[PDB]
Design a protein around this motif. Structure first.
Motif, PDB file in Angstrom:
ATOM      1  N   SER A   1       2.782   5.634 -13.849  1.00  0.00           N
ATOM      2  CA  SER A   1       3.722   5.274 -12.383  1.00  0.00           C
ATOM      3  C   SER A   1       2.497   4.418 -12.246  1.00  0.00           C
ATOM      4  O   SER A   1       1.478   3.916 -12.604  1.00  0.00           O
ATOM      5  N   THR A   2       2.424   3.058 -11.314  1.00  0.00           N
ATOM      6  CA  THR A   2       1.366   2.145 -10.420  1.00  0.00           C
ATOM      7  C   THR A   2       1.549   2.178  -9.443  1.00  0.00           C
ATOM      8  O   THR A   2       2.309   2.427  -8.295  1.00  0.00           O
ATOM      9  N   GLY A   3       0.923   1.549  -8.072  1.00  0.00           N
ATOM     10  CA  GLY A   3       0.356   1.499  -7.458  1.00  0.00           C
ATOM     11  C   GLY A   3      -0.591   0.151  -7.510  1.00  0.00           C
ATOM     12  O   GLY A   3      -1.346   0.434  -7.832  1.00  0.00           O
ATOM     13  N   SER A   4      -0.323  -0.260  -5.487  1.00  0.00           N
ATOM     14  CA  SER A   4      -0.996  -1.858  -5.138  1.00  0.00           C
ATOM     15  C   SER A   4      -0.659  -2.134  -4.309  1.00  0.00           C
ATOM     16  O   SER A   4       0.554  -1.848  -3.203  1.00  0.00           O
ATOM     17  N   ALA A   5      -1.743  -1.846  -3.341  1.00  0.00           N
ATOM     18  CA  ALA A   5      -2.417  -2.255  -2.522  1.00  0.00           C
ATOM     19  C   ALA A   5      -3.041  -3.745  -1.658  1.00  0.00           C
ATOM     20  O   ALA A   5      -4.331  -3.468  -2.358  1.00  0.00           O
ATOM     21  N   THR A   6      -2.831  -3.910  -0.835  1.00  0.00           N
ATOM     22  CA  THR A   6      -3.722  -4.646   0.225  1.00  0.00           C
ATOM     23  C   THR A   6      -4.521  -4.135   0.707  1.00  0.00           C
ATOM     24  O   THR A   6      -4.555  -2.965   1.231  1.00  0.00           O
ATOM     25  N   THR A   7      -5.878  -5.067   1.028  1.00  0.00           N
ATOM     26  CA  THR A   7      -7.178  -4.256   1.267  1.00  0.00           C
ATOM     27  C   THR A   7      -7.599  -5.694   2.688  1.00  0.00           C
ATOM     28  O   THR A   7      -7.843  -6.960   1.666  1.00  0.00           O
ATOM     29  N   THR A   8      -8.033  -5.698   3.438  1.00  0.00           N
ATOM     30  CA  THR A   8      -8.690  -6.633   4.500  1.00  0.00           C
ATOM     31  C   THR A   8      -9.636  -6.264   5.381  1.00  0.00           C
ATOM     32  O   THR A   8     -10.335  -5.138   4.953  1.00  0.00           O
ATOM     33  N   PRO A   9     -10.675  -7.115   5.459  1.00  0.00           N
ATOM     34  CA  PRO A   9     -12.321  -7.444   5.731  1.00  0.00           C
ATOM     35  C   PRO A   9     -11.620  -7.148   7.407  1.00  0.00           C
ATOM     36  O   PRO A   9     -10.694  -6.874   7.808  1.00  0.00           O
ATOM     37  N   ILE A  10     -12.668  -6.045   7.703  1.00  0.00           N
ATOM     38  CA  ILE A  10     -12.732  -5.337   9.152  1.00  0.00           C
ATOM     39  C   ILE A  10     -12.828  -6.014  10.465  1.00  0.00           C
ATOM     40  O   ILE A  10     -12.095  -5.376  11.319  1.00  0.00           O
ATOM     41  N   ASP A  11     -13.719  -6.791   9.801  1.00  0.00           N
ATOM     42  CA  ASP A  11     -14.252  -7.822  10.630  1.00  0.00           C
ATOM     43  C   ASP A  11     -14.632  -9.659   9.883  1.00  0.00           C
ATOM     44  O   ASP A  11     -14.823  -9.653   9.140  1.00  0.00           O
ATOM     45  N   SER A  12     -15.246 -10.891  10.977  1.00  0.00           N
ATOM     46  CA  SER A  12     -15.565 -11.913  10.793  1.00  0.00           C
ATOM     47  C   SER A  12     -16.317 -11.451   9.135  1.00  0.00           C
ATOM     48  O   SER A  12     -17.021 -12.969   8.623  1.00  0.00           O
ATOM     49  N   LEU A  13     -17.430 -10.375   9.387  1.00  0.00           N
ATOM     50  CA  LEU A  13     -18.684 -10.313   8.280  1.00  0.00           C
ATOM     51  C   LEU A  13     -17.971  -9.403   6.987  1.00  0.00           C
ATOM     52  O   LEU A  13     -18.846 -10.114   6.370  1.00  0.00           O
ATOM     53  N   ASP A  14     -16.996  -9.464   6.984  1.00  0.00           N
ATOM     54  CA  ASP A  14     -16.584  -8.066   5.635  1.00  0.00           C
ATOM     55  C   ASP A  14     -17.403  -6.676   5.620  1.00  0.00           C
ATOM     56  O   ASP A  14     -18.029  -6.292   4.760  1.00  0.00           O
ATOM     57  N   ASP A  15     -17.615  -6.614   6.345  1.00  0.00           N
ATOM     58  CA  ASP A  15     -18.829  -5.271   6.658  1.00  0.00           C
ATOM     59  C   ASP A  15     -18.174  -3.885   5.841  1.00  0.00           C
ATOM     60  O   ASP A  15     -18.955  -3.220   5.825  1.00  0.00           O
ATOM     61  N   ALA A  16     -16.647  -4.236   5.781  1.00  0.00           N
ATOM     62  CA  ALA A  16     -16.324  -3.004   5.168  1.00  0.00           C
ATOM     63  C   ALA A  16     -14.677  -3.715   4.984  1.00  0.00           C
ATOM     64  O   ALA A  16     -13.890  -4.425   5.819  1.00  0.00           O
ATOM     65  N   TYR A  17     -13.961  -3.397   4.428  1.00  0.00           N
ATOM     66  CA  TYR A  17     -12.707  -3.177   3.757  1.00  0.00           C
ATOM     67  C   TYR A  17     -11.574  -2.085   4.316  1.00  0.00           C
ATOM     68  O   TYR A  17     -12.156  -1.224   3.624  1.00  0.00           O
ATOM     69  N   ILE A  18      -9.983  -2.435   4.701  1.00  0.00           N
ATOM     70  CA  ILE A  18      -9.298  -0.924   5.026  1.00  0.00           C
ATOM     71  C   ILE A  18      -7.909  -1.374   3.894  1.00  0.00           C
ATOM     72  O   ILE A  18      -7.588  -2.556   4.360  1.00  0.00           O
ATOM     73  N   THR A  19      -7.726  -0.862   3.959  1.00  0.00           N
ATOM     74  CA  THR A  19      -6.079   0.005   3.232  1.00  0.00           C
ATOM     75  C   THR A  19      -5.343   0.686   4.179  1.00  0.00           C
ATOM     76  O   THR A  19      -6.002   1.824   3.860  1.00  0.00           O
ATOM     77  N   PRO A  20      -4.325   0.274   3.795  1.00  0.00           N
ATOM     78  CA  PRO A  20      -3.345   1.314   4.496  1.00  0.00           C
ATOM     79  C   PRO A  20      -2.903   2.665   3.584  1.00  0.00           C
ATOM     80  O   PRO A  20      -2.579   1.831   2.592  1.00  0.00           O
ATOM     81  N   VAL A  21      -2.537   4.304   4.280  1.00  0.00           N
ATOM     82  CA  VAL A  21      -2.679   5.160   3.384  1.00  0.00           C
ATOM     83  C   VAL A  21      -1.088   5.753   4.069  1.00  0.00           C
ATOM     84  O   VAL A  21      -1.408   6.004   5.441  1.00  0.00           O
ATOM     85  N   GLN A  22      -0.183   5.802   3.493  1.00  0.00           N
ATOM     86  CA  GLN A  22       0.573   6.862   4.133  1.00  0.00           C
ATOM     87  C   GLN A  22       0.139   8.000   3.557  1.00  0.00           C
ATOM     88  O   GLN A  22      -0.177   9.021   2.561  1.00  0.00           O
ATOM     89  N   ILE A  23       0.568   9.608   4.957  1.00  0.00           N
ATOM     90  CA  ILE A  23      -0.112  10.388   4.772  1.00  0.00           C
ATOM     91  C   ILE A  23       1.089  11.497   5.601  1.00  0.00           C
ATOM     92  O   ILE A  23       1.688  11.192   6.540  1.00  0.00           O
TER      93      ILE A  23
END
Length: 330
Positions: A1-23
């Motif tokens: 198996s594999t997975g591939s998810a886009t990760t997105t900066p939370i703000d204009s400074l790239d303070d952190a990145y968020i990735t959607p996760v299904q639970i």
């Protein structure tokens, strides 16, 4: 198996990145901070103290047909920035980018510290350090990666963080289109539970490369690059008007400056962090003092290759029996 998810900066400074996760079942999608510096998958939940929730999406285990209380299990974690969270534990189905793990420990927050409450964009953390750091008691739990590993086509995940742009986390394969040149692999120590490695040195701007061993961790959950005071002083000495401010809590520089690049060594290879990656903008709104992206580790106890460094590279977290890190330019 594999997975591939886009990760997105939370703000204009790239303070952190968020990735959607299904639970859960049906899926509950939460946006998690993938953190290669910790080993707990925890979420804002229906159990989180109501006054500590401010805009986050919550996991509600009672709405998941696959959730089961992990009876007796609790967790409590404190991060390098002074933030913390704690609660109880469910097992449930967790999917990232099409890769599904059943029976994943989902740590439900009862309490979170103010920094979590105040960040409406982060619904929890998904730890990707070694499972030896997981805080669940009395039965330590495995990370999402450790539970997925045996099912993956290759026992790897990769971080491809963007500069002021989305990027990608892949699990189980190495996208040979996502980087330039070749990947340089380097040894990892798991003794502290981190992706701990040794850089071979650094350069400031167009300066000569200094060969020197810098032990540190590859930590997607840390915004900045934290290095020894000698290295950091050598960098900021090349920026007119830069200084370390005890009041602000690190190096600041005039917002009018053009910052030099910073190069770090990976074996005989070199990763160049452009100067603009090191600009974290005004210290307070409208200030002409800007916060630097390279800071001293001296008050931490470890050097940290955080997002400032990692987003200049395609990074392979190789979870084979002998783990290794790989870095490529991109």
């Amino acid at each position: 198996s594999t997975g591939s998810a886009t990760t997105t900066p939370i703000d204009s400074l790239d303070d952190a990145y968020i990735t959607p996760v299904q639970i859960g079942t049906p899926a509950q999608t939460l946006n998690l901070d993938f953190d290669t510096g910790s080993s707990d998958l925890w979420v804002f939940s229906s159990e989180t103290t109501a006054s500590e929730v401010d805009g986050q999406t919550i996991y509600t285990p009672s709405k998941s047909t696959t959730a089961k209380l992990l009876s007796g299990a609790t967790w409590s974690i404190s991060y390098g920035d002074g933030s913390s969270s704690s609660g109880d534990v469910y097992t449930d189905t967790v999917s990232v980018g099409g890769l599904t793990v059943t029976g994943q420990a989902v740590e439900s927050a009862k309490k979170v510290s103010s920094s979590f409450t105040e960040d409406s964009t982060i619904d929890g953390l998904l730890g990707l350090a070694f499972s030896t750091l997981n805080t669940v008691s009395p039965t330590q739990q495995k990370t999402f990666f450790d539970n997925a590993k045996a099912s993956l086509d290759s026992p790897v995940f990769t971080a491809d963080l963007g500069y002021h742009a989305p990027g990608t986390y892949n699990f189980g394969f190495i996208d040979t289109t996502a980087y330039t040149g070749s990947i340089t692999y380097t040894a990892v120590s798991t003794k502290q539970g981190f992706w701990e490695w040794t850089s071979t040195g650094y350069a400031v701007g167009s300066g000569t490369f200094k060969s020197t061993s810098i032990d540190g961790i590859a930590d997607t959950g840390t915004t900045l690059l934290y290095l020894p005071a000698t290295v950091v002083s050598a960098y900021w000495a090349q920026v007119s008007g830069a200084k370390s401010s005890s009041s602000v809590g690190g190096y600041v520089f005039p917002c009018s400056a053009t910052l030099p690049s910073f190069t770090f060594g990976v074996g005989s290879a070199r990763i160049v962090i452009p100067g603009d990656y090191i600009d974290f903008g005004p210290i307070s709104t409208g200030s002409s003092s800007c916060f630097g992206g390279i800071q001293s580790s001296a008050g931490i106890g470890i050097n940290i290759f955080g997002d400032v460094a990692l987003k200049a590279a395609f990074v392979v977290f190789n979870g084979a029996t002998t783990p290794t890190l790989g870095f490529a330019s991109k």
